[PDB]
Symmetry: D2
Subunit: 251 residues, 4 copies
């Protein structure tokens, strides 16, 4: 029955070709937003767009690299051709190398910062004024539970996700006058294709034990919160961080 | 267009006869939940129930005092007669006397703790097992931005609202195994009947200036978040505190 | 070598007859504060005062019950007879019954709220103006890591400790103009006499595993932070919550 | 009277030639740590070292650029020649351009991230194992109140300071086994040489009004907390963020 007040506008979803991004794109499009699915992986972005269109929705794909500042602008222009851009979801991300801080490779550190932080910033530089010019709207940045707590051996990821909370607060303060809301979502561990394809059973049980609900989350359980926060029903929600974590951070 | 996945169940809304509670009740009932509106003020609870019924929804009123532990049980029993209780919103609250900590009257301190904290606890003692017995669901506790920051001269209120975050975390951890989610919502300052009836213009401008959006929130902007968190779409959200504050706490 | 800038004044330490309170009292007195040790247990308060005096320090005991608002005033008067009261540490507390929220006995809930929250408030009502009248100073409220996260079956304790963060924020805002700083300390699990006397080995290993340092904290490791925050070196620290938790809340 | 348990070891203080860094260096050296003052400005680093030596302390200067990963290693080697490195304070930082997110120059964004975040990481890569090899110790990262709240037009700074909280949490979790504590300090606005030399009176009054104490902080009020957290008295404090903000974040 869930329906989101997101129609009459376009939405960018970065990393939209799989997992959480796919779920976000499907959920927004099923409630009437015209979705621009961007992803580095063209096959995946095209597949999600085909699912949306087959279900009666409106979407277009644009394959490219969010670490190129020009791609952020190309994404905004493409979305505006569908309908006025009023939602952007900065979701693309990478996990990085597993290594303690002292041993973390410099190129992996810089790569994780570049994708998980700087590409969000590049996206927002294109998105903020564009959404303001369309009467306001919402930017949802995909942080993590690791935007507020740590997790050994993934310091670059944790650091970048913490950084996003501040970028979110600042843009919220600066663009409130144009009615551009900016929020961050913090998922716990989610069962996506990487998890069910590569995670060993001992690892899974260990992670499940850290969530009070005793399971990993599902992509659709993140997408619902994103779609809500992107919608007109969330019109007084800005600057804030919203956990969807099964109780992970409550202990 | 917003619709919440809350049908096929009953919902208790305490303090449901006016303001935020009224909006919560209307929003839940418009998406199909059978709502038990409780309030100390019988006229107000009956009026909201009449609005719900006139709009095609299902509701019943129960007037009484949430500081009586027996009223929490009477509320659960009455809701279960409508449909299985799977949502409870502990929203009733009072502001207390305006006085600094050192001068706060003992009877006003105790009264604010009793209504804003202990009555939530009494409600949860009835609600948690009852919702567990109906296959799980959600309890939404109405904290405030004053559950995480202070506000001079309202220490009893601030203290009680901070307390609710811990009660929420603990019940979330303890009842996750029964799939009873427990969350807290933190509204900024909201334009309800008390605000538009008694607040002077200088006070209003001062409070508006503390929210990045430059206005107070509206009751429906709180109710939407509550209804979302109470719904099946929020199935991985538990233990957490969710601000609807116009940017108040982002600076 | 640690020395705290706390001389030329008196300090109240509630619950000062054992464990963390004892360590706080000893540390403050060793740096020259005149300490009023209060405790419900007269034997214990007298023993700590004797230790202080034997080590060359200045202290007096007052046995009584912090849940009596008059005892807060008697404590302030007794401290002022030693030297001007400029430090108060509200440390007395109880753990409560172990039971989930839904089963928590009403009398145990109310008792934990009364000691761990309301007695802190009663203390502050006496302390705030008195410290202001002596040129300012500091109140240190003893919260816990359970002021910011939960712990199953101890909801009354968690709730009261969360409440203290708000009471601390509010008094800090209200009494900053009189230069009365108010802060909260959040210890992780600490090895006190209750822990080494009654905690089973399996429980201990479980708790140790939740702290990154792999051990419980020691009372002197809490007392040092309290003494620092109570001192003139902490003159710009007010309103804030300071963890001494071995990394417990960083994951 | 304040004395810190920091002798018998060396300490790196980056950005140690002025302001907060100068105060940190002076305070650590006055309690017996052998301090390596690093700064991009050689004149300033030499001046602080001369002050330390004239007061009877032990210090050496090393001028260079913390954004060069090799300088982090040169700093560790130089400190170890004085005494075993067991304290590192990553304090160097820049404010960045004043501009909203959408207009922030790419080169200024990258520069602020490089100094305020990545150079802290480069420092920690040298410091963590070195301190572990000397029996453990402490790294204090200089965040801000802007590690937890925003401030319009300084998004790069806010973002980098938020990032530091996560880097701090992660290193704390990963190096706890070697007894290397890692913490973050969050000063409010502080009256340093930049403030008293360039800040206009209207700006000052505006900032003072945001702190409950009604004034900006002094460098020595930050240095005391840093020195405490760097000391053996802080042996159970790791992973955590400690505000010295005059009440700024308590509202
Ligand atoms: Mg294409
Ligand atoms: Mg190694
Ligand atoms: Mg945790
Ligand atoms: Mg009736
Ligand atoms: Mg008065
Ligand atoms: Mg604030
Ligand atoms: Mg006696
Ligand atoms: Mg039972
Ligand atoms: Mg030189
Ligand atoms: Mg412009």
């Amino acid at each position: 029955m869930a329906q989101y007040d997101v129609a009459g506008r376009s939405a960018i979803v970065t990393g939209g070709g799989s997992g959480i991004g796919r779920a976000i794109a499907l959920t927004l499009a099923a409630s009437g937003a015209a979705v621009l699915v961007t992803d580095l992986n063209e096959e995946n972005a095209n597949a999600v767009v085909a699912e949306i269109s087959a279900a009666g929705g409106t979407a277009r794909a644009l394959a490219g690299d969010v670490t190129d500042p020009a791609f952020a602008e190309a994404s905004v222009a493409a979305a505006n051709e569908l309908a006025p851009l009023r939602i952007a979801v900065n979701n693309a991300g990478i996990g990085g190398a597993a290594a303690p801080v002292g041993d973390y490779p410099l190129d992996s550190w810089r790569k994780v910062i570049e994708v998980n932080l700087n590409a969000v910033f590049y996206g927002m530089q294109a998105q903020l004024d564009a959404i303001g010019a369309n009467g306001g709207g919402a930017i949802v940045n995909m942080a993590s539970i690791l935007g507020s707590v740590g997790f050994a051996n993934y310091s670059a990821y944790v650091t970048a996700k913490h950084a996003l909370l501040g970028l979110t607060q600042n843009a919220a303060l600066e663009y409130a006058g144009k009615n551009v809301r900016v929020v961050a979502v913090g998922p716990g561990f989610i069962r996506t294709p990487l998890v069910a394809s590569n995670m060993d059973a001992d690892t899974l049980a260990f992670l499940e034990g850290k969530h009070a609900l005793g399971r990993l989350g599902e992509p659709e359980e993140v997408a619902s919160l994103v779609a809500f926060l992107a919608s007109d029903a969330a019109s007084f929600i800005t600057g804030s961080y919203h956990l969807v974590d099964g109780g992970y951070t409550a202990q």
